[PDB]
Amino acid sequence: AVSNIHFCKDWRSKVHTWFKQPFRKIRRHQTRVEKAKAVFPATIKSLKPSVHCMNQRFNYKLRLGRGFTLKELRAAKIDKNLARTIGIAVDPRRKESSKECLNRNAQRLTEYMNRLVVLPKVHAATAKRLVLNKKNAEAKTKKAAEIKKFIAEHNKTIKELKIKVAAAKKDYAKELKACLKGLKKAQVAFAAQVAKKKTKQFNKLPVQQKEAKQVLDANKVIRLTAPCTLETKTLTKGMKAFDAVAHLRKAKNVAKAVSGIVKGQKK
Amino acid sequence: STEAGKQHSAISWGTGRAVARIPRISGSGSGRNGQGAFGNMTRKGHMFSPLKNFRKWQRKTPKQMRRFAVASCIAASAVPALVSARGHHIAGVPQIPLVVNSKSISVIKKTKQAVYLLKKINAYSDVLKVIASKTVRAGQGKMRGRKIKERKGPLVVYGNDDLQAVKAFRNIPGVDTCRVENLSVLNLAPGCHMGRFIIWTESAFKKLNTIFGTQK
Amino acid sequence: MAGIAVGLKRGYPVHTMTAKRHYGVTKRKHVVNDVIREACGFSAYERHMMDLLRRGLDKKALKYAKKHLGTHKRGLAKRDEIQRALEAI
Amino acid sequence: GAYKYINALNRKKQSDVLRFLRRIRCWELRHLPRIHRVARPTNPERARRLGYKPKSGFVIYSVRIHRGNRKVSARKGIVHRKPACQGIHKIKRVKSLQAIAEQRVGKHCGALRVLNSYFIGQDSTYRFFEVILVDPFNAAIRNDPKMNWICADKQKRREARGLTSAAKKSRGFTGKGRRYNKIGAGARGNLKRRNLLQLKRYRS
Amino acid sequence: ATRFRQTRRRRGHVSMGYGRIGKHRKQRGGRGNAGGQHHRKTWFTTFHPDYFGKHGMRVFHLKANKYYCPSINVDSLWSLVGKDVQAQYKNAKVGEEVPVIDCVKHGYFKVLGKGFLPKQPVIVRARYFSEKAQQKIKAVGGACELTA
RNA sequence: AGAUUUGAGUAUCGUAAGAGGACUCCCUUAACUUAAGCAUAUCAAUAAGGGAAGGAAGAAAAAAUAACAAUGAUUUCUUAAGUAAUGGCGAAUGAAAAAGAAAAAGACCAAGUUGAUA
RNA sequence: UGGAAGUAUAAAUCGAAAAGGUGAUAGUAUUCAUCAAAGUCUAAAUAUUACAGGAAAACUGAUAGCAAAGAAGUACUGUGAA
RNA sequence: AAAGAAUUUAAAACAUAUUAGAUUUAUCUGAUGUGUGAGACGGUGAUUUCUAGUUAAUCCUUUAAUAAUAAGGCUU
């Protein structure tokens, strides 16, 4: 084997021994310990999005980017100025890449905002936010009554068919298509009726006085990916005759044929 | 030191002066000017290849073989023939995989209680061997701090809830404790011999099936 | 089902999403240009390039704008500007 | 405004108006000493872009530098080097003329801080700049939150360490990307990091 | 382990295992791969014949993430999901549920055809397929999907 | 005589100088050595010369990667990797995006606007 | 410089914009993707064999370990750097 | 000529026609519908294979896609 050793240059002055590694681990661990002590949401490692990886080699694995785009904070009904101060990162630079990435992150904020519990800006019980809460209980109670009423009359149908298919799946794993076919028709009608609708520009910050339960970070309570189990499908007659290779050799050959089209039409 | 021995500016005198060709110091007027220089064989010169601090001090080992050696040092501590041959006085102990009730451990807070413990289960015939056979080290070890060279005694492998009893056993001569999770070959097999006298506890003994698993 | 990995139409079926903002000048820039053009005039290379265009040597005005600016797309943009001032007199 | 016409005018440096205006200034600065403070800047659109503001503590200094390359400083053009390093002429400095002139003003007026500098004119023999200096200890500089960062200790001799806009380019800090791989975070601080032979503690 | 070397057994030998007629002088033919075409040609000819020369075009900035395509043969497709799941669905047919061996999740993109698949219908979902892989899957009574 | 501009002296209140340079940001066109000679090349941002600072310094908010189921300031570590490339294609010199971690913070001038203008 | 019909810096000549740069095989054209240079600041993760205060050691133990375990950069040599 | 449902509810480019405020020059700035770009049906069909006719291209690459010059590859 022909040697390739880059020691001809000076190397004894280009060495870096790692003797501080046992003590670096201690030094950083005694910073987080002394950082959560100061204010615990300091080390909370403010929430990050759920973005895919670049390149086709890892284009199926999710990972935490940095900062939610301006489009996600508006879709999740969050103020962009306030979001930075409640342990949510913001990345105005990043541009939205897909409507699926817009919904996937918008749920990430909504779930977190329901878990979030903000203490009053002033500890004293005479704070205006706490005062305004008791001054608007009468209006809040009426709003919750009408929201609850019309959230149940609209889902009066989606509930029963989703109940049927969920219950009908128990028999088949101890007919089913009839319950699934009926559910599909109901959800189509619901989608059309919504389009055939202004809402709150912002939601409300959850502000309350509670016990101080301190959690070192927020990305580990909202999992990136739901657990994946074995996926099984119905083996029909259509999938038994799908010429997969013939499709690959057709899409590739079309790409190589865009050269002939331009050459032909240029003469 | 990197610059130890090579701090001079000596250039070899050369042939034609009836002296060897080893480098010689320049200048004059001192007993050192004109003497031998850098060469490894001279006096006040750098040695053979000087020891550099970036050598390989620590060594690596595969995990699945590091845990293989622990399961073979625990397994040999249940054989009284091996344990006795290692220098342990297990003549009077009731059972060589000795256990003690976790309730008895929970009341231990003073060393006179842990000493009474070691006597009750007849484990003090070994601790007294460490006390009665403590002598000084031989050679240059004493110049550097290491003076007393004791022997080995029983190992009290405690558990998760026996933490407050550590401060009791920790001053008896030749009684070293180690948590059940932190077991290693450096504990169960010191000096490469095998069969260390282990005094378990109920909490640690009943965990060994979860930590180590079984053969199936 | 899950798109194809080759060809022009390639990739997982998703709904991709950006404005192509045009970095242009305002309407008053047509005034700031003539204010300074009137005060300053033309360069030693813009005046000779005007001679070629008056005699109809349109191509040699480009090969003289490229020699003094070093970019083909910045020679056309300057030849047009020069010839748009010839028709303004 | 009145400054979006001056900026657009100053871009026509080949106009007959400017070429005459710069001809007088290049005559004036030839006979005046090499570095000498001028009362107010002569390119105020460029002066106020680089940081100058007409407040106390800010001063403007003019520096004249002799342009053109120079021979390698070896006696009689004799170099005991291999033919690879035997040239004398045609050896171009890395640091620009701007950085070189900036470092001269900083040394002469050592009590102040160089903020930036710009170009004024040139002739066949010289090239004249104008350096915008700041007096850190002035009470107006200290009490302005947007400019008191120049009173920090690390800004001493800002230009001899290569921190100004003109001297940073000579270090390669113009843009970003894969065209600037070797100057990612410093020309030499990057080189030492790549050439390091990392010896871990538990190494194979 | 410097007591195991050859120096500890070669004490008392004057030459120290390096010969008297030819001593242990510093260099024995240059430093490194010197003399590749002059006096070590009998080495780079006997042991590395194609070392000297040029072959193939130059890729100025190769992108190694676009040549990445792991492959799994058909015989190893059923081992992705397991041997218990294979036996569970061993009597399935057309119309009833069969497992989908999503190869892309496990890190295998291409699916090649080598060896024999068990005689059970199966669904295979992967980015690229080989011509003889599709026949082997279909002849057993299965399906060949595509992803991304 | 008066209103300005520019250039000086004197006085008051302050400022740079020198020490140190282990680590940090740089200016300079060394050679021994390797190529079994040697002249491009390697030694080599290496030795010497020179300038400047701090407790750390340097970089920092895209005229950036990418061709994606897209990412998103800077720095540092693992991996890519002795790989793509360069080279009397000889000796030899040799990165970066992707991916995994530590830490995470963004703001300002000029230009533009408001002028019983400050 | 790995950057190869030029990756970066500088010098001589030339030198723009009803903007434009990049997509590393020079060229022109039409699309497409991503950014919007030519001013400035910004703690944290990082480095260290100046120096000072400490703790350790499978390190040396007076020809060893710094050159120096004592009034050691001391006695002594040179005009001088040393 | 023969087999073939195709996967499912939060949206930005503005190509377009109409208005409101301005400009005169290589003219702009706003806002409201529309389709574009749209995907949730054995029988229909998106789609792919086969048989011959016609046209076009045809050794590989310049790494977002093509083109004609240029350059680089393989064999001799």
Automatic annotation (TrEMBL), chain A:
Keywords noted in UniProt: Coiled coil, Ribonucleoprotein, Ribosomal protein
GO terms for MF: RNA binding; structural constituent of ribosome
Classification via Pfam families: Ribosomal_L13e
GO BP term, example: translation
Coiled-coil ranges per UniProt: 151-174
Keyword Chloroplast: no
Assigned GO CC terms: cytosolic large ribosomal subunit
Similarity field: Belongs to the eukaryotic ribosomal protein eL13 family.
Protein name: 60S ribosomal protein L13, putative
UniProt source species: Entamoeba histolytica (strain ATCC 30459 / HM-1:IMSS / ABRM)
Phylogenetic lineage: Eukaryota, Amoebozoa, Evosea, Archamoebae, Mastigamoebida
From TrEMBL, chain B:
Molecular function in Gene Ontology: RNA binding; structural constituent of ribosome
Gene Ontology cellular-component terms listed: cytosolic large ribosomal subunit
Biased composition (Gly residues): 28-37
Region feature Disordered, mapped onto this chain: 23-42
UniProtKB keywords: Ribonucleoprotein, Ribosomal protein
Keyword Phosphoprotein assigned: no
Chain ranges passing through the membrane: none
GO biological process, one term: translation
Top-rank taxon: Eukaryota
Family the entry assigns: Belongs to the universal ribosomal protein uL4 family.
Protein name per the record: Large ribosomal subunit protein uL4
Native species: Entamoeba histolytica (strain ATCC 30459 / HM-1:IMSS / ABRM)
Stretch of the intact protein here: 55 to 270 of 431
Automatic annotation (TrEMBL), chain C:
Keywords, sorted A to Z: Ribonucleoprotein, Ribosomal protein
Sections of the chain in a coiled coil: none
Keyword Ribonucleoprotein set for record: yes
Record carries keyword Ribosomal protein: yes
GO cellular component, one term: cytosolic large ribosomal subunit
GO biological process, one term: cytoplasmic translation
Any GO MF annotation of the entry: structural constituent of ribosome
Stored InterPro entries: Ribosomal_eL36, Ribosomal_eL36_sf
Stored PANTHER family: 60S RIBOSOMAL PROTEIN L36
Family statement drawn from the similarity comment of this UniProt entry: Belongs to the eukaryotic ribosomal protein eL36 family.
Protein name per UniProt: 60S ribosomal protein L36, putative
Organism of provenance: Entamoeba histolytica (strain ATCC 30459 / HM-1:IMSS / ABRM)
Automatic annotation (TrEMBL), chain D:
Keyword list, A-Z: Ribonucleoprotein, Ribosomal protein
InterPro entries membership: Rbsml_eL15_core_dom_sf, Ribosomal_eL15, Ribosomal_uL23/eL15/eS24_sf
UniProt keyword Zinc-finger, yes or no: no
GO terms under cellular component: cytosolic large ribosomal subunit
Record has Lipid biosynthesis as a keyword: no
Gene3D superfamilies attached to this UniProt entry: Ribosomal protein l15e
GO terms of biological process kind: cytoplasmic translation
Listed SMART domains: Ribosomal_L15e
Domain of life: Eukaryota
GO molecular function, one term: structural constituent of ribosome
Family of this protein: Belongs to the eukaryotic ribosomal protein eL15 family.
The protein, known as: Ribosomal protein L15
Species this chain originates from: Entamoeba histolytica (strain ATCC 30459 / HM-1:IMSS / ABRM)
